């Protein structure tokens, strides 16, 4: 008896080329699932076979014009082959011309998404419930309360008062942390400043606990996709199929209410969700950061999942039911013994043994299914790592302060302070005047950039950029030219920002007017050491200078933030902002002005004692 | 056989030109709602048709001088067209010269406003979790406990009177603010007052923190107006219509008491609320931060809501009632089968199937497009900005007290 | 010319009988909307009319057998009338036989729900985040810490210690409220009891703030129904239509995807959602506590809303579009002048004027639409009323204690304590032994009732009830008989509860064994006042008696609560529980045993001082 | 014309008897899935039919002694029936005597477990918002701060040494527990240690309270097992099949390494995991509190899930593959038009439309029936029960310390 000619198509992992395919001849060139299946059927039916490949590379369809078949269905009908052992779907139009066996594999439409990965949080992500502009203003308000509580306590008739500057910074730190205090204010003016600082720290701590609970609750409500119902109702993730095939024709003629709504989305969608081939459809899933899902066959979805780089995952269940079968020509002697051989292999578990060998045992994603089990939700050390770093760094600093003050006291035991306090008061005052005087004149305060993204390419293109000041605006990228207008010379939202910068104008000018008064009285007190009231009055103008600058910065930053708030959001437009080095000089000028006001009071008390 | 000439006008989404209209020719150039309606009626009635745009570009009116109709009504009277499938409003003046069918779409006058978004927080928005009648009862109870703690401690001593009237206010302030106090009561009648006032503050502070967590988690936004009578009873938000059309003529000759008050406002208003075109009226709504409301037809108001940048919405219901009809010349043979076709499509749900396809399915933003996007944000400085202002104001007032204490120490 | 016969049907508010309808003749018997509309049309067309009522009471339809019409459509086709001014819907099968005008009213399908009312919260609803069994055990733990901290401090060599019983109850109260303390423990055994009570109060206070935020967040996510989309996706509220009419036939033949899902629910629903008439459909809405919604015409929905008792509300927009029209016979001279009269009345606002007069100006729900505007969410005085009542009641008690102790000190100024302390120690001990001895012997500890509801009638029918003890169970309603078995004589979930009562058995027997030891040593100390160690040792057995009973009650109540937790919940089954008067005798026995242990230590110290 | 005799078997929801079956007669008595399938095939093929229940009540088998088929297969071989529309499993032994069509339903072996519900809380479930590696780093940092506060305070005095090694542990314990302390540091190097340790506890306690509010608001429940390989790697949960059928014979002659380990467990297991009937196997799942899992076919497992009291669910996927077919006698003239009818119904989505109607639309509890019901509950005593046990255990240990201190005071 003569050999049976077997036709097959090249698909992985069904039939693949072996590596030594130039050096081998005959049936040993090939390997795969269908090669091992052809050896099993030929053992039961009892024939010899020569294994070939279809020349066209198609599965089989009828031309509407010429009414002829192509592919593997063509080689069966027109006589070129005797059996077709290949992933050939049992359909109606193929059943009328050839004979299929019972199915040896069941499959359907499935869903491919990108695998969820774990992103490590930042080390200082515990600071996230409040903006960084609040954490800066708490430190400014802490210095402001501690200086005023000193001045309002150590007056000229003071009795036996205790609130020096070292006790005042320790009282305010204990009140903010709600840890109690060793001593309390007893004067009526001391209780006013102590009472308002209690109401400040009550609102801030309750705002941190409340907004942190809002982060952890919204993150817990986020649930992934696990069915085809969830894709239909949820429209931040795009999904599409291949451009021409049986998968697209399924959603077209369907009448199921779930699948009608999915074809309504894929019909009217800009840009195209349909891809041209399978490799293009997988490549969109891997790079779109979890925003794209792909619909394909159930067996290719399980094969790509077991390959490197191991970054895709199959979710849900199948949407329909199909089958693959062995095909013979109509009216052949191989019709019945092939059909009994498939049912015999299916009951001895041999068909389930070959699927485990090619899909999983040659899997490069080694035992990936074990990693899908673990899931929990609690705080870990990655969330609160930066709190321990501040604790270690605080203990290391206390070792250094205990060491250098140990050697400083031993050296002392085994009008110098008046002269050193005189010279330190003057250097901080000149640096206090000069740093604010530069900052008001210059105009590098706020940077603003507005741009538009380019989709599907990961690139942004700006349209406008500038830097602004209190009176002068110079475009850095406006008309690609360094043109400079005043704020009165107008020309959208960026116009409304520039008007609010003009609103908070007077408060730095109040502070600059007050330091210049205190600078004159401080030098003429150094000229004439008699009439010692000049040092105490000059200290008050330094403290009123800094508190006038605090309400200037709070009202400035508040006027900036709400102008980004009222604008309409878009998915294609980004808007950023950034401070400048003039804003840093105003904040540094606060630190030098308050510190020079404290030294003037110690200059008063040490000089009034000698008088 | 004879080709019926169908006249129409070009307005979205009724009749639109396709993007490759230079390639195609004839009926394949056009698309829209009224094109799909022309295909359904010609199938039931049984004729063939050729779509033509009207040359004048107007719906229809009568000149008082020359008495000549212009527009789609002018083509039906003088014979240039056979049927007008278009949004033509069924009125009395047009009814005397041509014939309409039953209405295939019902509409009215509605209100367009800007969508409510996240707003600028007020300076005293930190005291929003508790109502105003709670904050005043805390102050009244603060004075009441400190008076009772003084009176009880006076005539019942147990040496020195550590609890005066000035020290009792300092004990009760430190107890509310979760801080400690240096002195404590030492009598049975004194420790009952301190014990109850401690249990008071543990409930109030825990109720404040628990209600901020409900606000920051779930975001509910409300619209200011929801009816036409609310616009008559306010003056914060301005409102107006287009300068020439049937919308302005409705508010002029209205005898309804609500609609007559609205016309006295719109007539004597400076600056002018009236606009030139439709797009200028939409543009004032988007730029005025929610201080302007535009009054237009309900079918356009639902169409602008479904287009980019998706910024507007419709509030309330319709103000009047009117309809759109299909017009034939007086005495045509098409008048009766067109009339029976519209009532047949309406009961089969086909007219609801076409409006659902062009208004909602072609919408750039769906109902669940805006619904799926949520995010949570860090607190900005503008939220807790009012707490800083009380702090600096308390620092300034504390220095004024120390001045007038020294003056009372200098005179003494 | 002859009078025109006008046919009409009796519907409110279209045509109604006037009150003097027996005493009037002609057209003045009737009133309504259609009576005022008939006077307007007859003014423009210029005729005289006599107004009649159709005899059948139907609107009009064709019999499938005999092919004849009935109702008002019948009187037009067969010649009995000349015009029909009535709410007659423009449909296709009516258009072929008679002539309608243009519509004078537009309407559709709408939704009727019960109006949301405001329910006042309880005065003590601030206690709701914790169960009442926790608030009881905090008070027991407060007494237990304050006694042990006294005993562990006032030992026999004590120096200069301060922790008496009046300072110990004040230290523990300040630690629970986190308000600080005047003095602290200094002995190592005093710091252990002070440290664990700090960890108890940290977990309890953090549990109250966290669960209160869970109440207010879930209540804020609850959103009502405002569209037909929300009825389809949300299935705790049933909705139905009338049993036979055009409203039901709309949902049957519809092909809209939203309306297909609504007919799928109303088809397969047990029991019946369909009602027989309109008055039955409104009556189900008013009594089903907001669990039922009704679908009806748009104009009857707006008319019922303006009538007493004013408890229904219209939500959403219309689902379809219909019209009402004037009908004349086909081929009549009244065809064209009626059609021009309707368009003339519609443009002069006269049709909108008559609708305001009958629907709203005769409205009994006077200006109800103004009350729908107000909406806010914050805590009010109704939520926290009980906190102010405790504050007022605490200040009123302090007035009474300050008054009676004022008269008590003035009377004293202008072995008695040993004898009174001797007799008070013995009476509390006998009452301590006798109250627990009754409670262990009896078996009225826990009541359990299980039943099943009866739907749509607001009535419950029990199936089983009993009371239980530590060894004996007697059924109160089991087999409607007072039968009594032991727990070993078993016969579901109630069996599992009864085994857990056996689990917490030993701990009351440990406490009863310890008081009987302390009772013997206390009396023989009263017999022999020498050898004064008998009073101090007997005080320790009283304190160890109560602490053994605390862990008995905690383990008992924990074993009860989780047995209601593991059972499967049903909408038709209710399960309740309740304590008995044996449980009250064990809790009272704790108060007498601890108090007798404190008096024994003062009996020791006052007697050892005289020795 | 000739009436075709259709044989079938009575199993829900395939073939069921209607409730008023005594009134009706003939084909009107029955309803179900396979009755609707018989109406569709007789319409395409073009015949009339008369439904009969098989008298034996069995699907089909062959006696080894008498070699006589019994059941629905026995009626097709010996001529009493013409076609068998029923869930008849396509096997090899039945294929040699009759002919099947292509499969109209695909199924396999699945796993039934009890639904995850709210569980009994453990005694130490109060420390669930923070992980175990955080609680040990708090203890390690507690010792580290108290040692540094001692060493710094010793050789740098500023009189008396208020901060010993025993007083430093008491300062740091009161600082973590939000209480106050009576003594405070008085040096620059000492106040830095107290300042940083205060900012540590403000973040940790606020992170504990914020994460309990996330747990109590949103309830997520997890199932223990989700695959067949998880049952092989555990011994907490028992599992078994029915005593006689194709489900037990699958695990016997299986050479797969996962399925062979499962048979060594099920054979040598005491007490017996095997049951008598299907309803007894479902009953052990509902009563054993989630310690038993039953292995059955996937089509019944989806049907029990949609019935009252709605207590079970299906986990994982199928273990094998098999199908159901329509059987005709070998050599009938109906064999080819029945085969082409099943492939025609399957592509038109009609077989998915019938399974969706009987499994899900007739379900007593839907997917959104269990989804719409939410409620929030007060904390019970069993949640915070472990905190009471530490308190009483601390009270007992404090009395043992005072005994051994007096003995060291008596010897001294």
PDB file of C-alpha atoms in Angstrom, chain A residues 482-598:
ATOM      1  CA  UNK A 482      13.469  87.223  24.618  1.00  0.00           C
ATOM      2  CA  UNK A 483      10.833  89.966  24.337  1.00  0.00           C
ATOM      3  CA  UNK A 484       9.983  91.856  27.527  1.00  0.00           C
ATOM      4  CA  UNK A 485       6.720  93.633  28.367  1.00  0.00           C
ATOM      5  CA  UNK A 486       5.393  95.048  31.600  1.00  0.00           C
ATOM      6  CA  UNK A 487       2.309  93.512  33.194  1.00  0.00           C
ATOM      7  CA  UNK A 488       0.258  96.562  32.164  1.00  0.00           C
ATOM      8  CA  UNK A 489       1.137  95.760  28.529  1.00  0.00           C
ATOM      9  CA  UNK A 490      -1.138  92.742  28.254  1.00  0.00           C
ATOM     10  CA  UNK A 491      -1.010  90.515  25.103  1.00  0.00           C
ATOM     11  CA  UNK A 492      -6.140  83.230  28.495  1.00  0.00           C
ATOM     12  CA  UNK A 493      -5.385  81.612  31.872  1.00  0.00           C
ATOM     13  CA  UNK A 494      -1.801  82.913  31.949  1.00  0.00           C
ATOM     14  CA  UNK A 495      -3.114  86.476  31.758  1.00  0.00           C
ATOM     15  CA  UNK A 496      -5.168  85.798  34.892  1.00  0.00           C
ATOM     16  CA  UNK A 497      -2.091  84.491  36.725  1.00  0.00           C
ATOM     17  CA  UNK A 498      -0.152  87.657  35.895  1.00  0.00           C
ATOM     18  CA  UNK A 499      -2.843  89.907  37.370  1.00  0.00           C
ATOM     19  CA  UNK A 500      -2.670  88.041  40.686  1.00  0.00           C
ATOM     20  CA  UNK A 501       1.084  88.651  40.937  1.00  0.00           C
ATOM     21  CA  UNK A 502       0.213  92.359  40.851  1.00  0.00           C
ATOM     22  CA  UNK A 503      -2.270  91.789  43.695  1.00  0.00           C
ATOM     23  CA  UNK A 504       0.260  90.651  46.328  1.00  0.00           C
ATOM     24  CA  UNK A 505       2.665  93.541  45.515  1.00  0.00           C
ATOM     25  CA  UNK A 506       2.452  95.786  48.691  1.00  0.00           C
ATOM     26  CA  UNK A 507       3.544  93.325  51.400  1.00  0.00           C
ATOM     27  CA  UNK A 508       7.252  93.007  50.426  1.00  0.00           C
ATOM     28  CA  UNK A 509       7.356  96.805  50.155  1.00  0.00           C
ATOM     29  CA  UNK A 510       6.057  97.100  53.722  1.00  0.00           C
ATOM     30  CA  UNK A 511       8.843  94.820  54.962  1.00  0.00           C
ATOM     31  CA  UNK A 512      11.569  96.671  53.056  1.00  0.00           C
ATOM     32  CA  UNK A 513      10.357  99.971  54.511  1.00  0.00           C
ATOM     33  CA  UNK A 514      10.596  98.599  58.054  1.00  0.00           C
ATOM     34  CA  UNK A 515      14.125  97.160  57.931  1.00  0.00           C
ATOM     35  CA  UNK A 516      15.477 100.467  56.636  1.00  0.00           C
ATOM     36  CA  UNK A 517      14.040 102.163  59.720  1.00  0.00           C
ATOM     37  CA  UNK A 518      15.591  99.561  62.012  1.00  0.00           C
ATOM     38  CA  UNK A 519      18.941  99.759  60.237  1.00  0.00           C
ATOM     39  CA  UNK A 520      19.289 103.490  60.949  1.00  0.00           C
ATOM     40  CA  UNK A 521      18.479 103.186  64.660  1.00  0.00           C
ATOM     41  CA  UNK A 522      20.818 100.203  65.052  1.00  0.00           C
ATOM     42  CA  UNK A 523      23.896 102.017  63.743  1.00  0.00           C
ATOM     43  CA  UNK A 524      23.336 105.218  65.737  1.00  0.00           C
ATOM     44  CA  UNK A 525      23.030 103.042  68.819  1.00  0.00           C
ATOM     45  CA  UNK A 526      26.483 101.730  67.942  1.00  0.00           C
ATOM     46  CA  UNK A 527      27.692 105.310  67.476  1.00  0.00           C
ATOM     47  CA  UNK A 528      26.278 106.455  70.835  1.00  0.00           C
ATOM     48  CA  UNK A 529      26.133 103.670  73.465  1.00  0.00           C
ATOM     49  CA  UNK A 530      24.263 105.997  75.823  1.00  0.00           C
ATOM     50  CA  UNK A 531      20.471 106.382  75.465  1.00  0.00           C
ATOM     51  CA  UNK A 532      20.100 102.589  75.391  1.00  0.00           C
ATOM     52  CA  UNK A 533      16.503 102.571  74.091  1.00  0.00           C
ATOM     53  CA  UNK A 534      17.732 102.498  70.469  1.00  0.00           C
ATOM     54  CA  UNK A 535      18.586  98.788  70.573  1.00  0.00           C
ATOM     55  CA  UNK A 536      15.223  97.701  71.989  1.00  0.00           C
ATOM     56  CA  UNK A 537      13.137  99.742  69.545  1.00  0.00           C
ATOM     57  CA  UNK A 538      15.206  98.587  66.552  1.00  0.00           C
ATOM     58  CA  UNK A 539      14.546  94.973  67.512  1.00  0.00           C
ATOM     59  CA  UNK A 540      10.796  95.479  67.168  1.00  0.00           C
ATOM     60  CA  UNK A 541      11.058  96.768  63.591  1.00  0.00           C
ATOM     61  CA  UNK A 542      13.036  93.665  62.626  1.00  0.00           C
ATOM     62  CA  UNK A 543      10.333  91.362  63.997  1.00  0.00           C
ATOM     63  CA  UNK A 544       7.522  93.337  62.353  1.00  0.00           C
ATOM     64  CA  UNK A 545       9.502  93.141  59.103  1.00  0.00           C
ATOM     65  CA  UNK A 546       9.433  89.353  58.979  1.00  0.00           C
ATOM     66  CA  UNK A 547       5.787  88.949  59.971  1.00  0.00           C
ATOM     67  CA  UNK A 548       4.824  91.356  57.194  1.00  0.00           C
ATOM     68  CA  UNK A 549       6.737  89.158  54.749  1.00  0.00           C
ATOM     69  CA  UNK A 550       5.023  85.942  55.901  1.00  0.00           C
ATOM     70  CA  UNK A 551       1.552  87.173  54.924  1.00  0.00           C
ATOM     71  CA  UNK A 552       3.080  88.295  51.645  1.00  0.00           C
ATOM     72  CA  UNK A 553       4.248  84.789  50.765  1.00  0.00           C
ATOM     73  CA  UNK A 554       1.056  83.053  51.928  1.00  0.00           C
ATOM     74  CA  UNK A 555      -1.148  85.384  49.877  1.00  0.00           C
ATOM     75  CA  UNK A 556       1.184  85.017  46.886  1.00  0.00           C
ATOM     76  CA  UNK A 557       1.189  81.202  46.829  1.00  0.00           C
ATOM     77  CA  UNK A 558      -2.573  81.061  47.428  1.00  0.00           C
ATOM     78  CA  UNK A 559      -3.163  83.340  44.435  1.00  0.00           C
ATOM     79  CA  UNK A 560      -1.043  81.073  42.233  1.00  0.00           C
ATOM     80  CA  UNK A 561      -2.611  77.729  43.190  1.00  0.00           C
ATOM     81  CA  UNK A 562      -6.253  78.595  42.515  1.00  0.00           C
ATOM     82  CA  UNK A 563      -5.442  79.829  39.006  1.00  0.00           C
ATOM     83  CA  UNK A 564      -4.402  76.314  38.049  1.00  0.00           C
ATOM     84  CA  UNK A 565      -7.591  75.142  39.738  1.00  0.00           C
ATOM     85  CA  UNK A 566     -10.268  76.974  37.736  1.00  0.00           C
ATOM     86  CA  UNK A 567      -8.911  76.042  34.304  1.00  0.00           C
ATOM     87  CA  UNK A 568     -10.533  73.232  32.337  1.00  0.00           C
ATOM     88  CA  UNK A 569      -8.577  69.969  32.271  1.00  0.00           C
ATOM     89  CA  UNK A 570      -7.764  68.071  29.060  1.00  0.00           C
ATOM     90  CA  UNK A 571      -6.052  64.767  28.330  1.00  0.00           C
ATOM     91  CA  UNK A 572      -3.812  66.364  25.691  1.00  0.00           C
ATOM     92  CA  UNK A 573      -2.676  69.535  27.512  1.00  0.00           C
ATOM     93  CA  UNK A 574      -0.135  69.742  30.344  1.00  0.00           C
ATOM     94  CA  UNK A 575       0.588  72.810  32.481  1.00  0.00           C
ATOM     95  CA  UNK A 576       3.490  73.162  34.916  1.00  0.00           C
ATOM     96  CA  UNK A 577       4.961  75.787  37.221  1.00  0.00           C
ATOM     97  CA  UNK A 578       8.186  76.340  39.134  1.00  0.00           C
ATOM     98  CA  UNK A 579       9.652  78.953  41.440  1.00  0.00           C
ATOM     99  CA  UNK A 580      12.756  81.019  40.767  1.00  0.00           C
ATOM    100  CA  UNK A 581      15.824  82.255  42.589  1.00  0.00           C
ATOM    101  CA  UNK A 582      14.178  85.558  43.504  1.00  0.00           C
ATOM    102  CA  UNK A 583      11.674  83.598  45.596  1.00  0.00           C
ATOM    103  CA  UNK A 584      14.539  81.913  47.438  1.00  0.00           C
ATOM    104  CA  UNK A 585      16.087  85.271  48.342  1.00  0.00           C
ATOM    105  CA  UNK A 586      12.877  86.464  50.000  1.00  0.00           C
ATOM    106  CA  UNK A 587      12.637  83.317  52.134  1.00  0.00           C
ATOM    107  CA  UNK A 588      16.281  83.583  53.223  1.00  0.00           C
ATOM    108  CA  UNK A 589      15.724  87.259  54.083  1.00  0.00           C
ATOM    109  CA  UNK A 590      13.088  86.163  56.607  1.00  0.00           C
ATOM    110  CA  UNK A 591      15.646  84.045  58.474  1.00  0.00           C
ATOM    111  CA  UNK A 592      18.219  86.832  58.769  1.00  0.00           C
ATOM    112  CA  UNK A 593      15.733  89.528  59.783  1.00  0.00           C
ATOM    113  CA  UNK A 594      14.157  87.554  62.641  1.00  0.00           C
ATOM    114  CA  UNK A 595      17.553  86.423  63.938  1.00  0.00           C
ATOM    115  CA  UNK A 596      18.877  89.993  63.963  1.00  0.00           C
ATOM    116  CA  UNK A 597      15.827  91.059  65.954  1.00  0.00           C
ATOM    117  CA  UNK A 598      16.599  88.505  68.659  1.00  0.00           C
TER     118      UNK A 598
END
